[PDB]
Amino acid sequence: VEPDAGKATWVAASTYGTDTTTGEEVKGALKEIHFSTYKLAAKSFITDET
Amino acid sequence: SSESYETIFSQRIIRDLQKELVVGALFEELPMSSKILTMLVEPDAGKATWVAASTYGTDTTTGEEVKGALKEIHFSTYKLAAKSFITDETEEDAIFSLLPLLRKRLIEAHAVSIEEAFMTGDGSGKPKGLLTLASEDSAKVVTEAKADGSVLVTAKTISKLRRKLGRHGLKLSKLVLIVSMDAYYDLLEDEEWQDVAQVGNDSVKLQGQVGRIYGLPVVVSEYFPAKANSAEFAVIVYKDNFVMPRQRAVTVERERQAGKQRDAYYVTQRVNLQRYFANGVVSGTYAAS
Amino acid sequence: VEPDAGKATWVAASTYGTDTTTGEEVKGALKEIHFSTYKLAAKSFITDET
Amino acid sequence: SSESYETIFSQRIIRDLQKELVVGALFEELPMSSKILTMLVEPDAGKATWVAASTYGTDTTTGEEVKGALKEIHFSTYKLAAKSFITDETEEDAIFSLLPLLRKRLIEAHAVSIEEAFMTGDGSGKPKGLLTLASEDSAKVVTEAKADGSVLVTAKTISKLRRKLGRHGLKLSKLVLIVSMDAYYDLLEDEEWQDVAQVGNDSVKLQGQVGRIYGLPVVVSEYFPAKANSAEFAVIVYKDNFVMPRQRAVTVERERQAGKQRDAYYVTQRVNLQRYFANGVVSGTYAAS
Amino acid sequence: SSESYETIFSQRIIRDLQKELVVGALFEELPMSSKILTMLVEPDAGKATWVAASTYGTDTTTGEEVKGALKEIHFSTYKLAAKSFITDETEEDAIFSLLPLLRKRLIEAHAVSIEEAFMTGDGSGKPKGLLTLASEDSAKVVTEAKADGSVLVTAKTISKLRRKLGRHGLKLSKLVLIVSMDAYYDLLEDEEWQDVAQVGNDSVKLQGQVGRIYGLPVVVSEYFPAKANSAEFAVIVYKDNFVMPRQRAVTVERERQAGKQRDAYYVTQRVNLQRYFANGVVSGTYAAS
């Protein structure tokens, strides 16, 4: 899905579907919406035999 | 599945909150359910049907007594379209609820368009818009600002327009000022704030519109075209001028196909802006003149 | 039919789809198709009778 | 049953028969089930796995060695459909011998342009294409042959071509080739057949489509035409890389109406081609000079 | 659970398929059994029996005739392996079986290292690269190929090398030679091809490794060092000495978890190689001389 870049998704579907501007209106987009998960670890030791 | 009814509740409640986008419009909504509310009367324009019925009601001019006043007040509202399918091929991945992100921004730009259309609109399929309804009354007045050069424009503008609003309502109820942030760039970082421009919270106090001008509070943002010749302003009593004549809203049809398998969320909305008077507003101007 | 011309085959279901121009495009071809041959009739004759 | 559900399961077998375009399509069809097949792994990326771990096992040079590989390896497909339609309204003729009679040619030009793009596609939507694959490492290496006139189309070129990539291909095991058609025409009509190359069959005894350079399945086909600059060859270990990421099975989708007196079939394919490692095919060239 | 108790036994069959790397492991398996393998015997020095012993069956020189001989027959391979791992949390994409994607190149790299070590090994832990073995014997005999500066890569070189060989060796029955592709690059792309080197295959038919010097299916491959000095050849009979002592069948060692998203598939190996005697191969040089 797209951040609705610039719409103009209102008209009453009535006056026009306006044959000029534009087609998108411009790029774009589709990155797309992805998520690089990042494991963020931890690590510890003692010798608790001590 | 999803893309369907269980959304719509959790969708129109999102609509029930930006319902309150207040970013220009908020009146007392006339609700409807039929289609047209058409009222067959002349409103407040001299009647005031006072009676002695007794002494002598001045037998000369005029009677009614002036223009006009029946419009008539018809009210068939406006079916408002938004529309955007989604990745309707992939909540077979049972995500239930990426739509808490993935929706709502549709309601965002949806309402963005709504309020822009409300305050800048042609008449048709919507109703009218503000600067548009400014733009046949010659409320384009002269020449309080001068072509965005020597624009240090104060409230003398607002003073004589306040005296224009010394009118038939009151003073400062409601009497507002939907503005620009370039109109704020005049009177934000002004040293005056003469009467008041700032802080206009001033506490905070009124709706959510901080900055006020004797209590004329603030709506800026992406409506006024610049280069001086739009209004800086919107001096209108919200009370006497306008209500909302709404009916329904979202009863979006989340229809499916729509090819390469996606779900036509054919988005519905039905509200209205409509007036009564001759004048309800002067604004700016703030012109290239 | 408009059989296999004026194309543009195959769909990725990609980003924002049509551009456009180009598309539609040439014939096409709304022809319409019709297929009636006619009688291509050879015709010998042999005397078998002798 | 005006294109209800009636061809498609035969269009299974027909589409399987259009796995028969060997000209690109000979690898292993990566089965899919998720959208992407992501592997995290550092693959052929450093080892030198050698353990005795004895005394030692490489301690000075180098460490990893070459980086890395944290590119890494994610494998999703593109759906590869087909704009496809006729007309349910002329289907009144009660014939319906016009099924693969009518059909196939669609699935033909479908897979035709599919594997065309598998020669000639950006990598995106259309997946990985041989010309871009010829370009992606610039194994278009120059000048082998001399731009459409008095040229060096030869196997000694292919010899040093192997002496580039038979490093990291094997050595004719099986390690195939694809030529162009005028690039075929010096090995069409050839005496040479430098080492072993003539002619094509030439035995026949295995697949080896047209051409047989050290027993090579060579592809003419050509959606790689002349223009003096060309991938006149494409010497390639065909099993190093380049899987075919299919997921599930066949998907003609007879969209119904679709009015305007015309049909609508959507004929998908969620196969792909995704490569593996660094290089894999040295090709050309037949630069334009 | 995969990578668990199953594909190990697949890794068996792949290790049987990775017998097949036609460059090196074309020797002779000794499948050992206790631990170290060893017979008592003194290497039989003088036998060369033929019991004549009629009169004094030669009573002069020497009386042994060969000091001593005890080298001897006592052999053990080592703990050879491939470390391997993945993260098994992410083939859970309804796979349980991407080991058709996953392994193989495992087994490739295993044997890649192995026959690499037969080009490049140390005698302890790994056995031996034979170029090492070429070095110790001073089999690097000079001057042959001049330093890659007017290279005198001839077979007259290999003829003097057979002047060593075909004494205790035979003539081309069986007898072999392993080159570099740079070393083949004088014998590829030539006319020389000396008494026979032609060409590569050529009939084709038997073990037909690339280059056919006096009927030697010659392995190229090479994990030699190149440039001026190496062993450009390997004038040997594989059947002279040179057996693989090996131990068991397959074992990948699957301590699985091991967290940190990394497994432990310790793809072992308990094979080896030694020769059998004294001189066995001359090769080079092909030095910086």
Coordinates of N, CA and C in Angstrom, one line a residue, chain E residues 145-283:
Chain E
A145 N 60.0 -24.9 -18.7 CA 59.3 -23.7 -19.1 C 60.0 -22.5 -18.4
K146 N 60.5 -21.7 -19.3 CA 61.3 -20.5 -18.8 C 60.4 -19.4 -18.3
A147 N 60.0 -19.5 -17.0 CA 59.7 -18.4 -16.2 C 58.5 -17.5 -16.6
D148 N 57.7 -18.1 -17.5 CA 56.8 -17.4 -18.4 C 57.4 -16.3 -19.1
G149 N 58.6 -16.5 -19.6 CA 59.3 -15.6 -20.5 C 60.0 -16.4 -21.6
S150 N 59.4 -16.5 -22.7 CA 59.6 -17.5 -23.7 C 59.5 -18.9 -23.1
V151 N 58.3 -19.4 -22.9 CA 58.0 -20.7 -22.2 C 58.4 -21.8 -23.1
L152 N 59.3 -22.6 -22.7 CA 59.7 -23.8 -23.4 C 58.9 -25.0 -22.9
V153 N 57.6 -24.9 -22.9 CA 56.7 -25.9 -22.5 C 56.7 -26.9 -23.7
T154 N 57.6 -27.9 -23.6 CA 57.6 -29.0 -24.6 C 57.3 -30.3 -23.9
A155 N 57.1 -31.4 -24.7 CA 56.9 -32.7 -24.1 C 58.3 -33.4 -24.2
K156 N 59.3 -32.7 -24.8 CA 60.6 -33.2 -24.7 C 61.1 -33.1 -23.3
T157 N 60.7 -32.0 -22.6 CA 60.7 -31.9 -21.1 C 60.0 -33.2 -20.5
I158 N 58.8 -33.5 -21.0 CA 58.1 -34.6 -20.4 C 58.7 -35.9 -20.9
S159 N 59.5 -35.8 -22.0 CA 60.2 -37.0 -22.5 C 61.3 -37.3 -21.5
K160 N 62.1 -36.3 -21.1 CA 63.1 -36.6 -20.1 C 62.5 -37.0 -18.8
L161 N 61.3 -36.5 -18.6 CA 60.6 -36.8 -17.4 C 60.2 -38.3 -17.5
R162 N 59.8 -38.8 -18.7 CA 59.5 -40.2 -18.8 C 60.8 -41.0 -18.8
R163 N 61.9 -40.3 -19.2 CA 63.2 -41.0 -19.1 C 63.5 -41.3 -17.7
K164 N 63.0 -40.5 -16.8 CA 62.9 -40.9 -15.4 C 61.9 -42.0 -15.2
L165 N 60.7 -41.8 -15.7 CA 59.5 -42.6 -15.3 C 59.6 -44.0 -15.9
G166 N 59.3 -44.2 -17.2 CA 59.1 -45.4 -17.9 C 60.2 -46.5 -17.7
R167 N 61.2 -46.2 -17.0 CA 62.0 -47.2 -16.3 C 61.2 -48.0 -15.4
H168 N 61.2 -47.6 -14.1 CA 60.3 -48.2 -13.2 C 58.8 -48.0 -13.5
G169 N 58.5 -46.9 -14.2 CA 57.2 -46.8 -14.8 C 57.1 -47.6 -16.0
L170 N 55.9 -47.5 -16.6 CA 55.6 -48.1 -17.9 C 55.6 -47.0 -18.9
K171 N 54.9 -47.2 -20.0 CA 54.7 -46.2 -21.0 C 53.2 -46.1 -21.2
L172 N 52.6 -45.1 -20.6 CA 51.3 -44.6 -20.9 C 50.2 -45.6 -20.6
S173 N 50.5 -46.4 -19.6 CA 49.7 -47.6 -19.3 C 50.0 -48.0 -17.9
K174 N 49.4 -47.3 -17.0 CA 48.3 -46.4 -17.2 C 48.8 -44.9 -17.4
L175 N 49.4 -44.4 -16.3 CA 50.2 -43.2 -16.4 C 49.5 -41.9 -16.6
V176 N 49.8 -40.8 -15.8 CA 49.1 -39.6 -15.9 C 49.9 -38.4 -15.5
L177 N 49.1 -37.3 -15.4 CA 49.6 -35.9 -15.5 C 48.4 -34.9 -15.2
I178 N 48.7 -34.0 -14.3 CA 47.8 -33.0 -13.9 C 48.4 -31.6 -14.1
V179 N 47.7 -30.8 -14.8 CA 48.2 -29.5 -15.2 C 47.5 -28.3 -14.6
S180 N 47.8 -27.1 -15.0 CA 47.1 -25.9 -14.8 C 46.6 -25.4 -16.1
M181 N 45.6 -24.6 -16.0 CA 45.0 -24.1 -17.3 C 45.9 -23.1 -17.9
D182 N 46.7 -22.4 -17.1 CA 47.8 -21.7 -17.7 C 48.9 -22.7 -18.2
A183 N 49.0 -23.8 -17.5 CA 49.9 -24.9 -18.0 C 49.3 -25.6 -19.2
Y184 N 48.0 -25.7 -19.2 CA 47.3 -26.2 -20.4 C 47.3 -25.2 -21.5
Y185 N 47.5 -23.9 -21.1 CA 47.3 -22.9 -22.1 C 48.4 -22.8 -23.1
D186 N 49.6 -23.5 -22.9 CA 50.5 -23.8 -24.0 C 50.0 -25.0 -24.7
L187 N 49.2 -25.9 -24.1 CA 48.8 -27.1 -24.8 C 47.4 -27.1 -25.2
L188 N 46.5 -26.3 -24.6 CA 45.4 -25.7 -25.3 C 46.0 -24.6 -26.2
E189 N 45.4 -24.4 -27.3 CA 45.6 -23.2 -28.2 C 47.1 -23.3 -28.7
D190 N 47.4 -24.2 -29.6 CA 48.7 -24.5 -29.9 C 48.6 -25.2 -31.3
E191 N 49.8 -25.7 -31.7 CA 49.8 -26.8 -32.6 C 50.6 -27.9 -32.0
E192 N 51.0 -27.6 -30.7 CA 52.0 -28.4 -30.0 C 51.5 -28.9 -28.7
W193 N 50.8 -30.0 -28.6 CA 50.7 -31.2 -29.5 C 52.0 -31.7 -30.2
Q194 N 52.7 -32.5 -29.5 CA 54.1 -32.8 -29.7 C 54.4 -34.2 -30.3
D195 N 54.2 -35.3 -29.6 CA 54.2 -36.6 -30.3 C 52.8 -37.2 -30.2
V196 N 52.2 -37.1 -29.1 CA 50.7 -36.9 -29.0 C 50.4 -36.1 -27.8
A197 N 49.6 -35.1 -28.0 CA 48.9 -34.4 -26.9 C 47.5 -34.1 -27.4
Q198 N 47.3 -34.6 -28.6 CA 46.0 -34.2 -29.2 C 44.9 -35.0 -28.7
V199 N 43.8 -34.4 -28.2 CA 43.8 -32.9 -28.1 C 43.3 -32.7 -26.8
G200 N 42.3 -33.5 -26.4 CA 41.6 -33.2 -25.2 C 40.7 -34.4 -24.8
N201 N 40.2 -35.1 -25.8 CA 39.0 -35.9 -25.5 C 39.2 -37.4 -26.0
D202 N 39.6 -37.7 -27.2 CA 39.5 -37.0 -28.5 C 38.6 -37.9 -29.3
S203 N 38.7 -39.2 -28.9 CA 37.9 -40.3 -29.4 C 36.4 -40.2 -29.3
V204 N 35.8 -40.0 -28.1 CA 36.3 -39.5 -26.8 C 36.7 -40.7 -25.8
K205 N 35.6 -41.2 -25.2 CA 35.4 -42.6 -24.7 C 35.9 -42.8 -23.3
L206 N 37.2 -43.0 -23.0 CA 37.6 -43.4 -21.6 C 37.7 -42.2 -20.7
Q207 N 38.7 -42.2 -19.8 CA 38.8 -41.3 -18.6 C 39.1 -39.9 -19.1
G208 N 39.4 -39.7 -20.4 CA 39.3 -38.5 -21.2 C 39.3 -37.1 -20.6
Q209 N 40.1 -36.9 -19.5 CA 40.3 -35.7 -18.9 C 41.1 -34.8 -19.9
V210 N 40.9 -33.5 -19.7 CA 41.1 -32.6 -20.8 C 42.6 -32.4 -21.2
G211 N 43.0 -32.6 -22.4 CA 44.3 -32.8 -22.9 C 44.6 -34.3 -23.0
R212 N 45.2 -34.7 -24.1 CA 45.4 -36.2 -24.2 C 46.9 -36.4 -24.6
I213 N 47.8 -36.3 -23.6 CA 49.2 -36.4 -24.0 C 49.6 -37.8 -23.9
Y214 N 50.0 -38.4 -25.1 CA 50.3 -39.8 -25.3 C 49.3 -40.7 -24.7
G215 N 48.0 -40.3 -24.9 CA 46.9 -40.9 -24.2 C 47.0 -40.7 -22.7
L216 N 47.1 -39.4 -22.3 CA 46.9 -39.1 -20.9 C 45.7 -38.3 -20.8
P217 N 44.5 -38.8 -20.4 CA 43.4 -38.0 -19.8 C 44.0 -37.1 -18.8
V218 N 44.3 -35.9 -19.1 CA 45.0 -35.0 -18.2 C 44.0 -34.1 -17.4
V219 N 44.1 -34.2 -16.1 CA 43.4 -33.3 -15.2 C 44.0 -31.9 -15.3
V220 N 43.2 -30.9 -15.6 CA 43.7 -29.6 -15.4 C 43.3 -29.2 -13.9
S221 N 42.1 -28.6 -13.8 CA 41.6 -28.1 -12.5 C 42.5 -27.1 -11.9
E222 N 43.6 -27.6 -11.3 CA 44.7 -26.9 -10.7 C 44.3 -26.1 -9.4
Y223 N 44.9 -26.5 -8.3 CA 44.9 -25.5 -7.2 C 46.4 -25.4 -6.9
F224 N 47.1 -25.3 -7.9 CA 48.5 -25.0 -7.8 C 48.6 -23.5 -7.6
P225 N 49.8 -23.0 -7.3 CA 50.1 -21.7 -7.6 C 50.5 -21.6 -9.1
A226 N 50.4 -20.5 -9.7 CA 50.8 -20.4 -11.1 C 52.1 -19.7 -11.3
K227 N 52.1 -18.8 -12.3 CA 53.2 -17.9 -12.7 C 54.6 -18.4 -12.5
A228 N 55.3 -18.5 -13.7 CA 56.7 -19.0 -13.8 C 56.9 -20.3 -13.1
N229 N 57.0 -20.3 -11.7 CA 57.3 -21.5 -11.0 C 56.0 -22.2 -10.5
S230 N 55.9 -23.4 -11.0 CA 55.1 -24.4 -10.3 C 55.5 -25.8 -10.8
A231 N 54.6 -26.7 -10.7 CA 54.6 -28.0 -11.5 C 53.6 -27.8 -12.6
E232 N 54.0 -27.5 -13.8 CA 53.1 -27.4 -14.8 C 52.4 -28.7 -15.2
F233 N 53.0 -29.8 -14.8 CA 52.5 -31.1 -15.2 C 52.5 -31.9 -13.9
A234 N 52.5 -33.2 -14.1 CA 52.6 -34.2 -13.0 C 52.8 -35.6 -13.5
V235 N 54.0 -35.8 -14.0 CA 54.3 -37.0 -14.8 C 54.4 -38.1 -13.8
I236 N 53.3 -38.9 -13.8 CA 53.1 -39.9 -12.8 C 52.4 -41.1 -13.5
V237 N 52.4 -42.2 -12.8 CA 51.3 -43.1 -12.9 C 50.5 -43.1 -11.6
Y238 N 49.2 -42.8 -11.7 CA 48.3 -42.8 -10.6 C 48.3 -44.2 -9.9
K239 N 48.5 -45.3 -10.7 CA 48.5 -46.6 -10.3 C 49.9 -47.1 -9.9
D240 N 50.8 -46.2 -9.7 CA 52.1 -46.6 -9.2 C 52.0 -46.9 -7.7
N241 N 51.8 -45.8 -7.0 CA 51.8 -45.9 -5.5 C 50.3 -45.4 -5.1
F242 N 50.3 -44.5 -4.2 CA 49.2 -43.5 -4.2 C 47.9 -44.0 -3.9
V243 N 47.7 -44.6 -2.8 CA 46.3 -45.0 -2.4 C 45.7 -44.1 -1.5
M244 N 44.4 -44.0 -1.5 CA 43.7 -43.4 -0.4 C 43.6 -44.4 0.7
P245 N 44.2 -44.2 1.9 CA 43.6 -44.9 3.1 C 42.4 -44.1 3.5
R246 N 41.3 -44.8 3.7 CA 40.1 -44.2 4.3 C 39.7 -45.0 5.5
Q247 N 38.8 -44.4 6.3 CA 38.2 -45.1 7.4 C 36.8 -45.5 7.1
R248 N 35.9 -44.7 7.6 CA 34.5 -45.1 7.8 C 33.7 -44.7 6.5
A249 N 32.4 -44.7 6.7 CA 31.5 -44.1 5.8 C 31.3 -42.7 6.3
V250 N 30.1 -42.1 6.0 CA 29.8 -40.7 6.3 C 29.6 -40.5 7.8
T251 N 29.8 -39.3 8.2 CA 29.3 -38.7 9.5 C 29.3 -37.2 9.4
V252 N 28.2 -36.6 9.5 CA 28.1 -35.2 9.8 C 27.8 -35.1 11.3
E253 N 28.4 -34.2 12.0 CA 28.2 -34.3 13.4 C 27.3 -33.1 13.8
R254 N 26.1 -33.5 14.3 CA 25.0 -32.6 14.5 C 24.7 -32.4 15.9
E255 N 25.7 -31.9 16.7 CA 25.3 -31.1 17.8 C 24.4 -30.0 17.2
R256 N 23.1 -30.0 17.5 CA 22.3 -29.1 16.8 C 22.4 -27.7 17.5
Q257 N 21.7 -27.5 18.5 CA 21.7 -26.2 19.2 C 22.6 -26.3 20.5
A258 N 23.7 -25.5 20.6 CA 24.2 -24.3 19.9 C 23.2 -23.2 19.5
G259 N 22.9 -22.3 20.5 CA 22.1 -21.2 20.1 C 22.8 -20.2 19.2
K260 N 22.6 -18.9 19.5 CA 23.1 -17.7 18.8 C 22.7 -17.8 17.3
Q261 N 21.6 -18.5 17.0 CA 21.1 -18.8 15.7 C 22.2 -19.4 14.8
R262 N 22.9 -20.4 15.3 CA 23.9 -21.0 14.5 C 24.0 -22.5 15.0
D263 N 24.0 -23.4 14.0 CA 24.0 -24.8 14.3 C 25.4 -25.4 14.4
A264 N 25.6 -26.7 14.2 CA 26.9 -27.3 14.1 C 26.6 -28.6 13.4
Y265 N 26.9 -28.6 12.1 CA 26.8 -29.8 11.3 C 28.2 -30.2 10.9
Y266 N 28.8 -31.1 11.6 CA 30.3 -31.2 11.5 C 30.5 -32.3 10.5
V267 N 30.6 -32.0 9.3 CA 30.6 -32.9 8.2 C 31.9 -33.5 8.1
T268 N 32.1 -34.7 8.7 CA 33.4 -35.2 8.9 C 34.0 -35.8 7.7
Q269 N 35.1 -36.4 7.9 CA 35.9 -37.1 6.8 C 37.0 -37.9 7.5
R270 N 37.2 -39.1 7.1 CA 38.3 -39.9 7.8 C 38.9 -40.7 6.6
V271 N 39.4 -40.0 5.6 CA 40.1 -40.5 4.5 C 41.5 -39.9 4.5
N272 N 42.3 -40.4 3.6 CA 43.7 -39.9 3.5 C 44.3 -40.3 2.2
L273 N 45.6 -40.1 2.1 CA 46.4 -40.5 1.0 C 47.8 -40.6 1.5
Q274 N 48.5 -41.7 1.1 CA 49.9 -41.6 1.0 C 50.3 -42.4 -0.3
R275 N 51.5 -42.3 -0.7 CA 52.0 -43.0 -1.9 C 52.2 -44.5 -1.6
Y276 N 53.4 -45.0 -1.8 CA 53.8 -46.4 -1.5 C 55.3 -46.6 -1.5
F277 N 56.1 -45.6 -2.0 CA 57.5 -45.9 -2.1 C 58.3 -44.6 -2.1
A278 N 59.0 -44.3 -3.2 CA 60.1 -43.4 -3.2 C 60.0 -42.3 -4.1
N279 N 60.4 -42.4 -5.4 CA 60.0 -41.5 -6.4 C 58.7 -42.0 -7.0
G280 N 57.8 -41.1 -7.4 CA 56.6 -41.5 -7.9 C 56.1 -40.6 -9.0
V281 N 56.6 -39.4 -9.0 CA 56.2 -38.4 -10.0 C 57.3 -37.4 -10.1
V282 N 57.6 -37.0 -11.3 CA 58.3 -35.8 -11.6 C 57.4 -34.9 -12.2
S283 N 57.6 -33.6 -11.9 CA 56.8 -32.5 -12.6 C 57.7 -31.3 -12.5

